[PDB]
Each structure stands twice: as C-alpha cells, then as structure tokens.
C-alpha cells in the first residue's frame, strides 16, 4: 500500500541526515 512508502522514506532521507524526510517519501508516491 501507500503506508508502505511513505515508511519507507526513512530509509533515504536517513541516507542524507534527515533534511527532507516526508519530501523523499514522495518517491513512493511518483
């Protein structure tokens, strides 16, 4: 599902620190 992605965004934004956490997640959505 979308929980899935948006959840799984921890994983890249924590790649890069943590600037933009919910905007990296947008990659699961597009």
Same mark, same amino acid.
């Given at each position: 599902?979308?929980? @899935?992605?948006? =959840?799984?965004?921890?994983?890249?934004?924590?790649?890069? =620190? =943590?600037? =933009?956490?919910?905007?990296?997640? @947008?990659?699961?959505?597009?």
């Amino acid at each position: 599902g979308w929980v @899935a992605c948006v =959840g799984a965004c921890g994983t890249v934004c924590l790649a890069s =620190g =943590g600037v =933009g956490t919910e905007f990296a997640a @947008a990659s699961x959505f597009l």
